Amino acid sequence: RMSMVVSGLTPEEFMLVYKFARKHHITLTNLITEETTHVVMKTDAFVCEQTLKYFLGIAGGKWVVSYFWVTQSIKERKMLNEHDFEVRGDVVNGRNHQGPKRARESQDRKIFRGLEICCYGPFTNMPTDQLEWMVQLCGASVVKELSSFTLGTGVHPIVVVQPDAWTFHAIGQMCEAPVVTREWVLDSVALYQCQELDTYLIPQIP
Ligand code: NI
């Protein structure tokens, strides 16, 4: 059926989403899972901030809708079309990138289709497993150890790092993979278009 989480709301706002869920028989949870069908984002009059629920929502090719879907569907005393409320973008990667949509329609051709990714080093605003979960949803295959990369010529390995979380340009010294920054993933995921690694490469010492 339907299952929702919310992002960037206030309790009153949440109250409304509840009221909405209550009336329409929609399941409403604190945590996002595979089952979650909808992510309701606080937006301007339809840009939201980039939250984790925001990313995993796109990663799952789910319904990433602005809070206005809710308040209107209450105002109209009926449930409107997820289609005319969607999140057209966000502050970070442009107010007009249509990420979520792209994501819904692209469930065959996933941006990280046929990749091997190792989220290496420590991470901040994201549990690594969540970052990892993210990339699995985008058709990447997760590696956990630099040295566990597959030898098949067909596959492409990538080391993802978040430089902030350290006290690491020697990666290229420990394997033969490109090193990029978490922004690569994030940026790729919002836009749902696998980015030119170029911008994101980290210097690897010989
Ligand atoms: Ni190649």
Swiss-Prot record:
Disease: Breast cancer: A common malignancy originating from breast epithelial tissue. Breast neoplasms can be distinguished by their histologic pattern. Invasive ductal carcinoma is by far the most common type. Breast cancer is etiologically and genetically heterogeneous. Important genetic factors have been indicated by familial occurrence and bilateral involvement. Mutations at more than one locus can be involved in different families or even in the same case.
Cellular location(s): Nucleus; Chromosome; Cytoplasm
Outcome recorded upon mutating T37A: In BC; pathogenic
Effect of M41R: In BC; uncertain significance
Documented effect of changing P100R: In ovarian cancer; uncertain significance; abolishes ACACA binding and strongly reduces BRIP1 binding
Listed result of changing I117S: In BC; pathogenic
Phenotype for S106A: No effect on in vitro phosphorylation by ATR
Transmembrane segments: none
Expression across tissues: Isoform 1 and isoform 3 are widely expressed. Isoform 3 is reduced or absent in several breast and ovarian cancer cell lines.
Listed name of the protein: Breast cancer type 1 susceptibility protein
Boundaries of the shown chain within the full protein: 1649 to 1859 of 1863
Posttranslational modification: Phosphorylated in response to IR, UV, and various stimuli that cause checkpoint activation, probably by ATM or ATR. Phosphorylation by AURKA regulates centrosomal microtubule nucleation.
Phenotype upon changing T37I: In BROVCA1; pathogenic
Organism taxonomic ancestry: Eukaryota, Metazoa, Chordata, Craniata, Vertebrata
Subunit structure: Heterodimer with BARD1. Part of the BRCA1-associated genome surveillance complex (BASC), which contains BRCA1, MSH2, MSH6, MLH1, ATM, BLM, PMS2 and the MRE11-RAD50-NBN protein (MRN) complex. This association could be a dynamic process changing throughout the cell cycle and within subnuclear domains. Component of the BRCA1-A complex, at least composed of BRCA1, BARD1, UIMC1/RAP80, ABRAXAS1, BRCC3/BRCC36, BABAM2 and BABAM1/NBA1. Interacts (via the BRCT domains) with ABRAXAS1 (phosphorylated form); this is important for recruitment to sites of DNA damage.
Origin species: Homo sapiens (Human)
Task performed by this protein: E3 ubiquitin-protein ligase that specifically mediates the formation of 'Lys-6'-linked polyubiquitin chains and plays a central role in DNA repair by facilitating cellular responses to DNA damage. It is unclear whether it also mediates the formation of other types of polyubiquitin chains. The BRCA1-BARD1 heterodimer coordinates a diverse range of cellular pathways such as DNA damage repair, ubiquitination and transcriptional regulation to maintain genomic stability. Regulates centrosomal microtubule nucleation.
Effect of V155D: In BC; benign; functionally neutral in vitro
